Amino acid sequence: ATILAEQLEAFVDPILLRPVDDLELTVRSANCLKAEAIHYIGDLVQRTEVELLKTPNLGKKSLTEIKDVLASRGLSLGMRLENWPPASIADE
Amino acid sequence: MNKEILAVVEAVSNEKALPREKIFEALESALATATKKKYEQEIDVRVQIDRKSGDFDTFRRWLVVDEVTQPTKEITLEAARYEDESLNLGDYVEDQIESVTFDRITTQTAKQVIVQKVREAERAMVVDQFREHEGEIITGVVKKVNRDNISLDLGNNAEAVILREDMLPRENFRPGDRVRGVLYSVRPEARGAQLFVTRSKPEMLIELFRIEV
Amino acid sequence: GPEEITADIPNVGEAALSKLDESGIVYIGAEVTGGDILVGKVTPKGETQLTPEEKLLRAIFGEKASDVKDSSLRVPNGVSGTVIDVQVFTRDGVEKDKRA
Amino acid sequence: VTEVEIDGVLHEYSTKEGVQEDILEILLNLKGLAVRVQGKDEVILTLNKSGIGPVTAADITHDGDVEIVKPQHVICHLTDENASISMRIKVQRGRGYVPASTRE
């Protein structure tokens, strides 16, 4: 093996991060939140439900759809973010 | 409001004295169980019992607390400030709904889960029946012979288990014979109330002589 | 009752009908393995008589005149392939489903 | 090459309207494609061609590192005025012979 080697050394939250339109509900339930220039459900969780109820852009059926979405407790739980990002949501 | 459940409520051969409404909830979650596997968790036994409705739509809950345990059923007062502090401490305020699990398909599995729920209700009823007496000097007839255990069959579709440790050493029993003793188990047993008699205790022959003289 | 050719059947898994469409028949082009489901088929079981515990199930689910087992067609154990052509023939009078 | 996705083709045993070879023969002619890659593990090449005549191997929209070494290689023959193929080709590195049955 020494001879043959020397013969070769000259070669070698996921619901909040998802969009409102990605929700299982209809497009109207997403558009009710999207009328306030919201694209992510994290923006919906950043605002209170009372603040959304004080705007007539949401409808009566949209309130029931929002309740059905909040029944999973992933969104609209009355939270407050920095702007968008949590610590797990970090830039890398 | 098809009123099928209304007349389905009043069948009522065996669940007249049993909790009717609870059996609808039972059968409704059984229609909702069977082929669900996605959603977020499972279903919900709790559901707005609307007698009139009949097909009570499985509603969810939010349970107002001051704690962070049971994530899909957790509120606080600070979250109740968005509802203008209308929520109080400890309430079970429902703020969500659920649907059904289907078709052709999923409904003999729903039949199967309807049967499962009916069985659970029957077990509860049997427990209540055994609690009515709570141990008495009743007899019975052996039917099956298990290892270090004797199965007895009484009346009104009732079965009792005879421990071999509470039996006589030489005196061996078999099927077809009739034995009598005092039971001492109707509370916590196993999926109901396993009637456990003891034909070896003194009080066992206390009324045995009383039955004669 | 008759048999159900629809996908709506029990005892399944995401692996039980992840290649079937909304009406039981496998797609044209779905490359299957040995032992998947091509056509989902459920048949009736026992009749006997209406039991006391199943008296409420006698008529409270539209098509509750039949039971439900499992008799779906499967690829015989050993062969792979790619489904290239599906024919559906219907005896006249029977409701055509959406894929027919 | 490993994967091909012709646009209007479900399974490899079908036929596309307006090309005188089957989809299986297009897969063999793409299997014989002689291509160099430079700085990647795998790469996705894009092919678009419309009009009467051959679809040579020089009709692939080349990336900034993929280099075709024989651009006269025929794949298929389009045979109508409005009948066009549009496929995505997946070319990757490897070693030896890795068939389809082992590894969609």
Tab-separated table of C-alpha atoms in Angstrom, chain D residues 16-96:
chain	number	residue	atom	x	y	z
D	16	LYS	CA	-50.202	15.664	-25.723
D	17	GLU	CA	-52.191	17.339	-28.508
D	18	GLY	CA	-49.722	18.541	-31.121
D	19	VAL	CA	-46.456	16.602	-30.722
D	20	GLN	CA	-45.713	13.551	-32.822
D	21	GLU	CA	-43.972	11.617	-30.033
D	22	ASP	CA	-45.510	10.219	-26.878
D	23	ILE	CA	-44.724	11.625	-23.457
D	24	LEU	CA	-42.707	8.469	-22.795
D	25	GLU	CA	-40.470	9.145	-25.798
D	26	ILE	CA	-40.001	12.740	-24.615
D	27	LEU	CA	-38.856	11.306	-21.285
D	28	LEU	CA	-36.301	9.061	-22.999
D	29	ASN	CA	-34.988	11.950	-25.109
D	30	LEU	CA	-34.669	14.069	-21.960
D	31	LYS	CA	-32.969	11.154	-20.192
D	32	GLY	CA	-30.273	11.361	-22.808
D	33	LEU	CA	-29.612	15.056	-22.114
D	34	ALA	CA	-25.958	16.018	-21.665
D	35	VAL	CA	-25.753	18.991	-19.320
D	36	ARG	CA	-23.137	20.585	-17.038
D	37	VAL	CA	-23.918	22.354	-13.765
D	38	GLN	CA	-21.398	24.437	-11.890
D	39	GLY	CA	-22.292	25.690	-8.434
D	40	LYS	CA	-25.395	23.877	-7.203
D	41	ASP	CA	-26.654	20.559	-5.913
D	42	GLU	CA	-29.801	20.444	-8.053
D	43	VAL	CA	-31.234	22.940	-10.519
D	44	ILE	CA	-34.524	23.499	-12.357
D	45	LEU	CA	-34.396	24.303	-16.072
D	46	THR	CA	-37.377	25.766	-17.928
D	47	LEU	CA	-38.436	24.990	-21.504
D	48	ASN	CA	-40.907	26.924	-23.643
D	49	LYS	CA	-41.320	26.422	-27.384
D	50	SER	CA	-44.124	27.158	-29.835
D	51	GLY	CA	-44.344	26.603	-33.583
D	52	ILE	CA	-43.944	23.955	-36.288
D	53	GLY	CA	-40.666	22.088	-36.112
D	54	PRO	CA	-38.265	20.445	-33.686
D	55	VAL	CA	-37.761	21.305	-30.045
D	56	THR	CA	-33.995	21.162	-29.820
D	57	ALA	CA	-31.997	21.163	-26.598
D	58	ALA	CA	-30.916	24.766	-27.197
D	59	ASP	CA	-34.475	25.985	-26.533
D	60	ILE	CA	-34.046	25.638	-22.775
D	61	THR	CA	-33.917	28.938	-20.894
D	62	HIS	CA	-30.436	28.554	-19.434
D	63	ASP	CA	-29.624	29.798	-15.941
D	64	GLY	CA	-26.476	31.634	-14.906
D	65	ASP	CA	-24.479	28.452	-14.331
D	66	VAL	CA	-26.122	25.594	-16.270
D	67	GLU	CA	-24.379	24.890	-19.586
D	68	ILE	CA	-25.696	22.596	-22.296
D	69	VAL	CA	-22.797	20.810	-23.985
D	70	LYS	CA	-24.650	19.526	-27.094
D	71	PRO	CA	-27.286	22.034	-28.233
D	72	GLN	CA	-28.330	20.094	-31.357
D	73	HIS	CA	-30.053	17.379	-29.313
D	74	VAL	CA	-33.627	16.820	-30.445
D	75	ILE	CA	-36.309	16.212	-27.827
D	76	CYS	CA	-39.590	16.138	-29.759
D	77	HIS	CA	-41.322	17.592	-32.822
D	78	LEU	CA	-44.130	20.125	-32.594
D	79	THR	CA	-46.412	19.770	-35.552
D	80	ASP	CA	-49.051	22.533	-35.634
D	81	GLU	CA	-49.206	26.322	-35.626
D	82	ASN	CA	-50.757	26.709	-32.162
D	83	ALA	CA	-49.584	23.649	-30.249
D	84	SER	CA	-46.905	24.279	-27.673
D	85	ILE	CA	-45.091	22.381	-24.929
D	86	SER	CA	-43.937	24.062	-21.734
D	87	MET	CA	-42.039	21.910	-19.280
D	88	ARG	CA	-39.885	22.094	-16.183
D	89	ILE	CA	-36.800	19.882	-16.000
D	90	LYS	CA	-34.928	18.961	-12.808
D	91	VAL	CA	-31.194	18.246	-13.190
D	92	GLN	CA	-29.023	17.138	-10.282
D	93	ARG	CA	-25.646	15.695	-9.313
D	94	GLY	CA	-25.139	12.069	-8.418
D	95	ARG	CA	-23.009	8.972	-8.780
D	96	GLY	CA	-23.725	5.695	-10.559
